[PDB]
Amino acid sequence: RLEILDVTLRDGEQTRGVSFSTSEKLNIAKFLLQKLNVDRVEIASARVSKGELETVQKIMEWAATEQLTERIEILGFVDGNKTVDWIKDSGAKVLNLLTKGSLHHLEKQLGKTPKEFFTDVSFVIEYAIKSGLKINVYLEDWSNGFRNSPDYVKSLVEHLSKEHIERIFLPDTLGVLSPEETFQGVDSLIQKYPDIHFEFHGHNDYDLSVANSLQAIRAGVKGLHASINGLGERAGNTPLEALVTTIHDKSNSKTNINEIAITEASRLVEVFSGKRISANRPIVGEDVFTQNLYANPILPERFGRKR
Amino acid sequence: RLEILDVTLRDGEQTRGVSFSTSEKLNIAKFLLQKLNVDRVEIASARVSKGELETVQKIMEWAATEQLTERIEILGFVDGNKTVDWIKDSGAKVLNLLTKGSLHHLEKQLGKTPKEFFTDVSFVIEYAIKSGLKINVYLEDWSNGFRNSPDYVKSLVEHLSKEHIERIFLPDTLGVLSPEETFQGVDSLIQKYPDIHFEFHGHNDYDLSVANSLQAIRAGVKGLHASINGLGERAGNTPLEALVTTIHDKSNSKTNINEIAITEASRLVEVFSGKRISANRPIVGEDVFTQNLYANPILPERFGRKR
Ligand SMILES: [Zn+2]
Ligand SMILES: [Zn+2]
């Protein structure tokens, strides 16, 4: 039922010391969609550079070949025509628009009025649709926004509710939420807009992202974001391997992920990204199954290991 | 207010490929108690071997020298006179007794009746007190016990409530709990025995140990167990560095831990244990602060880093 958006390729490209070659990104994207069976993959950020543009084009060429074109998403910005033009040239068909989700961010970075910014936003979305794209919208810094400026947040969502978008992403951008706060923030919007597909996007700064995600599910979220091995800036994103296992074992919700591919996915990302994981890393660590009286539902063969 | 028991030295000694020399254990114990300022340290398991016996003796010699003798705890077993004699010779003054906390474990491993086992337990506790020791008791496999055999659990705690012990530990031994389940299990006992000092002991198998701990605090726990870098078997224990930060920032409870020593503690354990942590490891990872609009309460100087 729940959709899973992997952001390993986009955020990983942001991680210190990490840079995937075109072949590597292609290899990883293919595995995530076909083997792990994640619903969608966010593979790059618009306007980063050519080559990246080239990488996305090569990935889209393949995607067409497999009828997976709409499962690839590109993170973009409210920059007029730039992001949309870039994506148009890339061959990608889905834009994940980064919009200021807190009054504080809007004012301090853009110095624009909510109405003025909402207008810039409407321009991008309309132009995107004109250009043959579908749009998902990130409420950047939402975790601070609903706690310090809930009015702005409500007006933003209200504006977007009138727009022709596919989903609204609720990101704990700076990773400052507790599970309680997450349920509250999510519940606050899902009740007001019961007809909108919201997805929660956690960050692991306090090692609370999977727990926050579970509460997000409790509040009515229809999707969740995560990355393999938590790859990403700072403390990274919600760890996909642990998120999926926890959803399957500790919640009454489901995912389309093939658990058996989880181990190889982690190994793939670790080698290609060059970012080592610890041996005790939940579900995927080398020593995680070592030690029937002491048996957990977390068995090695379940994730394609030890057989 | 909340007490913190570090189990890095005891559980780490159990971790695959890990073995601390006497000097290393001494160095680490000293840092944990004097610098990080954790309340107590569980440094070894009784009867493991001589040398370990020697290591504990050397550590106690030092402890006396600093008036810290009672802050060192030794994990022991219901084995008659063996564990107590071992601890007596070690110089340690506190026993953390491992007792079967689930009917399933009791029957499958000991094949004894609750009354028969409770008698073995009373023998150890009495002999321990006779030997000049203080006792804390672990309800091993409690996380499965209160969910699959709450009657046995209640009778066990009832028996222990009549015993002269210092605290009762509620361990999620196999690391199978969700935060909701943790609050329920803990709340169930704290209400029946409001005059007992319970502590929650989480395991990170689902990357839910810090979240479970927060709920444990909510249910009335007076202490929590954790280890540096989550060192320990399988997925390890609740990560001390993240647990403390989360308690301080996301709960109204407090800890005596000196946050500024957190980074060096992690580096110390990583080098001596030989178990690498990932660069994105919450609060302590190398890239955790890299990337004032995007600033978290999690600053480098707060944990003794970047200055
Ligand atoms: Zn993010
Ligand atoms: Zn344990």
Main-chain dihedrals φ then ψ at residue B15, nearest 5 degrees? -60, 140
CB A20 within 8 A of CB A13: yes
**Residues listed for chain A:** 307
A247 reaches B (C-beta below 8 A): no
CB A250 within 8 A of CB A215: no
Residue B271: count of CB within 10 angstroms of its CB: 11
Collapse the DSSP code of B247 into the 3-class scheme (helix H, G, I; strand E, B; otherwise coil) and give the result. helix
Using a CB-CB cut-off of 8 Å, the residues of chain A touching B108 are: 293
CA angle A61/A65/A70 to nearest 5° reads 75
Question: Terminus-to-terminus CA distance in chain B, angstroms?
Answer: 29
The residues that bridge with A5 in the sheet, in sequence order, are A40, A225
Residues belonging to the binding site of A are 10-11, 138, 173, 201, 203
Main-chain dihedrals φ then ψ at residue A263, nearest 5 degrees? -65, -50
B11 Cα to the center of ligand 2, angstroms: 7
* CB half-sphere exposure, A222, CA atoms < 13 A: 12
Closest CA of chain A from B95, distance in Å: 23
Helices then strands, each counted (H, E), chain A:
12, 8
From the list B136, B134, B123, the residue with the least C-alpha distance to B82 is B123
B176 reaches A (C-beta below 8 A): yes
Collapse the DSSP code of B220 into the 3-class scheme (helix H, G, I; strand E, B; otherwise coil) and give the result. coil
Residues whose CB falls within 8 Å of the CB of residue B44, separated by 6 or more in sequence, listed in order: B9, B10, B13, B25, B52, B55, B56, B74, B75, B90
Residues belonging to the binding site of A for pyruvate are 10-11, 138, 173
From the list A6, A1, A2, A3, the residue with the least C-alpha distance to A240 is A6
From the list A226, A224, A233, the residue with the least C-alpha distance to A275 is A233
- Using a 10 angstrom Cβ sphere, with 0-12 exposed, 13-18 middle and 19 or more buried, the burial of residue B292 is exposed
Using a CB-CB cut-off of 8 Å, the residues of chain B touching A283 are: 205-207, 235
Breaks in chain A, after residue numbers (C to N greater than 2.5 Å)? 291
Range list of β-strands (E), chain A = 3-6, 40-45, 72-77, 94-100, 134-140, 167-171, 198-201, 223-226
Dmax over Cα atoms in chain A, in whole Å?
Answer: 63
Sign of CA dihedral B35, B37, B40, B42: negative
**Alpha-carbon distances, residue A304 vs A230, A264, B196 (angstroms):** 19, 8, 44
Q: Which residues of A83-117 are buried (b: 16+ CB within 10 A; e: fewer)?
A: bbebbbebbbbbbbbbbbbbbbbbbeeeeeebeeb
**Alpha-carbon distances, residue A60 vs A54, A94, A201, B233 (angstroms):** 10, 11, 24, 43
B276 reaches A (C-beta below 8 A): yes
CB A168 within 8 A of CB A137: yes
Are residues B173 and A294, on separate chains, in Cβ contact within 8 Å?
yes
A129 reaches B (C-beta below 8 A): no
From which experimental method does this structure derive?
X-ray
Are residues A276 and B275, on separate chains, in Cβ contact within 8 Å?
no
Question: If contacts are CB pairs under 8 Å, which of residues 1-60 in chain B contact chain A?
Answer: 15-17
Query: What would the two tokens of residue B291 be?
Result: 């990337």
From the list B109, B11, B90, B99, the residue with the least C-alpha distance to B47 is B90
B27 Cα to the center of ligand 2, angstroms: 23
**Could you give all domains of chain A from N- to C-terminal order, each with its CATH number?**
1-307 (3.20.20.70)
Q: Which residues of A244-282 are buried (b: 16+ CB within 10 A; e: fewer)?
A: bbbbeebeeeebebbbebbbebbbbbbebbebebbbbbb
Question: What dihedral angle (degrees, nearest 10) is formed by the CA atoms of A245, A251, A257, A261?
Answer: 20
From the list A270, A267, A276, A239, the residue with the least C-alpha distance to B276 is A276
B10 as an active site residue: the answer is: yes
CB A8 within 8 A of CB A269: yes
A235 reaches B (C-beta below 8 A): yes
* CB half-sphere exposure, A180, CA atoms < 13 A: 6
Residue A258 Cα to chain centre, angstroms: 18
Q: Which residue of A has its CA nearest to B213?
A: A208
Could you tell me the resolution of this structure in angstroms? 2.0
B232 Cα to the center of ligand 2, angstroms: 8
State which H helix or E strand residue A204 sits in. Answer: none
**Alpha-carbon distances, residue B33 vs A12, A82, A306, B29, B248 (angstroms):** 38, 56, 40, 6, 19
Tell the residue number behind the tokens 């506790």, with chain if given: B125
CA angle A58/A63/A66 to nearest 5° reads 135
Three-state SS letters, B102-133: CHHHHHHHHCCCHHHHHHHHHHHHHHHHHCCC
